[PDB]
Amino acid sequence: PVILVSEDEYGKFDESTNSILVGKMHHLGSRVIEPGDELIVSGKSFIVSDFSPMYFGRVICGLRPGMDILEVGVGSGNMSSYILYALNGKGTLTVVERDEDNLKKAMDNLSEFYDIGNVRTSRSDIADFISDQMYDAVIADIPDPWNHVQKIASMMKPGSVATFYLPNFDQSEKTVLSLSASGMHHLETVELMKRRILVREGATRPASDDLTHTAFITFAIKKSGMVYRI
Amino acid sequence: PVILVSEDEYGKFDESTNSILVGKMHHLGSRVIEPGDELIVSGKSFIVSDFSPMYFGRVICGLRPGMDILEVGVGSGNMSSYILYALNGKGTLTVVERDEDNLKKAMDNLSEFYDIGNVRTSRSDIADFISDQMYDAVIADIPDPWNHVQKIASMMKPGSVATFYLPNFDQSEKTVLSLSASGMHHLETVELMKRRILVREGATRPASDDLTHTAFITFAIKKSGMVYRI
C-alpha cells in the first residue's frame, strides 16, 4: 500500500513506518495497514490503495496480466476484447450477462480473435449471480447499478476499483449517491464525449460519424471496512 | 494478418487462401501478404493488419506485454506510466524528449513507482534521433508532428500504429494532411472531451475541475510499401 486516495486530495503512505504524507505529514500508532483501509486524518477520509496508473498524475483504468476481472453486462464484447488483450492469457475474465442472445453473440465474436479458455460466463442477472471468488476489478455496464452496489461490493477485493458506465447524467448521479451505503468510496465521475472528425469532405458516411457520443464513467474503490483515526 | 483496415470500411483477410471479405468476397492471385501491404480492390484501398482490439468493433489503442514502444514527447510521464503498467516488465519503452528538465522530472516520477530497467531515453529532438530499431507502436505528443512523419514512419514496423496527440483542430488537420506522403495511412481522428462531474455541491475546488479538457487524437497505420490490385 503506497497511495492514499479520495474524492479530492491524494497522498502517499509508507507501511514500514505507517507515515502519511498529503505536503504535510502525520503518523499512525503498529497494526498492519491494508489496501481499502480508511484513514481519517483531521476529519478527512483517505482510502489506502496499492499503486495503479490511474493515480499516477494525482500523486506526482489499470489493466495488467494476472488479474481476475468481473464484467457485468457484456454489450458487443468490445470491452471484453480489450480486457483479454491486456490480460495476455494470464488471469481470468468472468462475464455476467442477463440476455442469453447478447451473451452468445459476444462470446462468438470474441472466440474469432481470442483463445477464450480464461473466460467464464454466467447467464444471469447480477442480483442472482453467486460467486465464491473475489475480483481484482469490476467493470459494469448495466441499466440500474444503484440496485446492485452491495452485491458488487461483496465480491471486490479491498482496495480494488469498480468502473460504472452510464448513458446519462441523472443515472450517473443516482449511481454515485448509492456508493457510500455499499462499502465503496467514490473517486470520480467523468463525462466523456467523443466525435469523429476529418472525414473526407463531402463524402457519404454513416450517420453515426457526425454524432457526438457521450459516456458517464464513475470510478469507486472498495473499502476493507477498517477505519483508523489520527 | 487477419484484418483489412481503412479510413472507412473494414474487412477480413485469410492468408491461407488469400481471400478478401469486405459482405462481398474477392481473391488475390500466390505471393505472401504481409501486415502493412495495401490491397486495392475496385479502386478502394485497404491496409493489411494483424488483429488489434482497436479494430474489434469495426470487424464484428492496444498495449500488451512484449511490445517495443517509442514515445516521442514525454509530458509528465503519465502516458509512460500507463505504458509500463501494460508492458508488465516485458518489452521496452523508448522515450525521446527534447527538454532535459522535463525528461529528468518524468523519469524521476516514474522510478518512484516502476522498475525502469526496460526504459531507454534520448534527450534529443525527434529529427536528430537515430535508432536502429523498428517499433511496434509510436505514441507522439509533440508540437509539430507534420514535420517528422517521414522520420517517425521510417522506424515503424509495417502494419504498426502511430497515435498523435494534438491540442486543437487546426494542428490535427495539418497532421492528417501530412500522413500520405510519409507512408502512413490515416485510420481516424477523434475529438475527445472530458469533464469531471458530481463534485460535492458548493465545495471549494481546483479551477481545472469545472473545465472541459479537449484532445485531438489521430491514429495512422504504417504501410509496407507493397501494393496489390485486384
Q: A63 to chain B: which residues are within 8 Å by CB?
A: 86
Q: Which residues pair with A92 in a beta bridge?
A: A68
A 10 A CB-CB count for B10 gives: 18
CA distance A114 to A107: 10
Please report the domains of chain B, with CATH numbers, ordered by start residue.
1-230 (3.40.50.150)
What is the sign of the dihedral through the CA atoms of A7, A9, A12 and A18?
negative
In a mutagenesis test of the B interface, which of A3, A175, A198 is the best target, namely the one with the most B β-carbons within 10 Å? A198
For residue B170 the three cell numbers come to: 487546426
User: With contact defined as beta carbons under 8 Å apart, do B77 and B105 qualify?
Assistant: yes
Cβ pair A113:B2 closer than 8 A: yes
- What Å resolution does this PDB entry report? 2.0
Closest to B160 measured CA to CA, from B66, B76, B68: B68
Residue with cell 521510417: B154
Residue with cell 488483429: B51
Q: How far is B88 from chain A (nearest CA, A)?
A: 7
Residue B224 burial class via C-beta count within 10 angstroms: exposed 0-12, middle 13-18, buried 19 and up: middle
User: With contact defined as beta carbons under 8 Å apart, do B106 and B97 qualify?
Assistant: yes
Q: B60 to chain A: which residues are within 8 Å by CB?
A: 76-77, 109, 112
For residue B88 the three cell numbers come to: 508488465
Secondary structure (3-state) at B118: coil
Q: Chain A residue with minimal CA distance to B216?
A: A197
A/B interface, count of CB pairs below 8 Å: 109
Q: Who's near B156: CB < 8 A, 6+ residues apart? A: B134, B135, B138, B162, B184, B222
Cβ pair A194:B189 closer than 8 A: no
Q: Which residues pair with B190 in a beta bridge?
A: A196, B217
In a mutagenesis test of the B interface, which of A14, A58, A82, A113 is the best target, namely the one with the most B β-carbons within 10 Å? A113
Binding positions of B for S-adenosyl-L-methionine: 97, 125, 141
Closest to A191 measured CA to CA, from A174, A169, A209: A169
User: With contact defined as beta carbons under 8 Å apart, do A205 and A152 qualify?
Assistant: no
